[PDB]
């Protein structure tokens, strides 16, 4: 039960990966190449009102 389960990552790489994932979420050819359905959807980075 003392196997090394948890692993530590540097915080700068933890933030770098968030920035890279948000940057990859902006391009339309990436996200269709994952498997979502954005064929009849307006703009890529969707931004609704604060009434939502």
């Amino acid at each position: 039960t003392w196997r090394r389960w948890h692993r530590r990552v540097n915080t700068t790489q933890k933030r770098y990966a968030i920035c890279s994932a948000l940057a990859a979420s902006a391009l339309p050819a990436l996200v269709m190449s994952k498997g979502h359905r954005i064929e009849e959807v307006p703009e890529l980075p969707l931004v609704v009102e604060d009434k939502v």
């Binding site: 391009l27 339309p28 954005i38 064929e39 009849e40 959807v41 307006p42 703009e43 890529l44 980075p45």
Partner: peptide, 8 residues
């Protein structure tokens, strides 16, 4: 326009 696949 890219980033607009409704009209792309």
């Amino acid at each position: 326009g890219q980033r607009k696949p409704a009209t792309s």
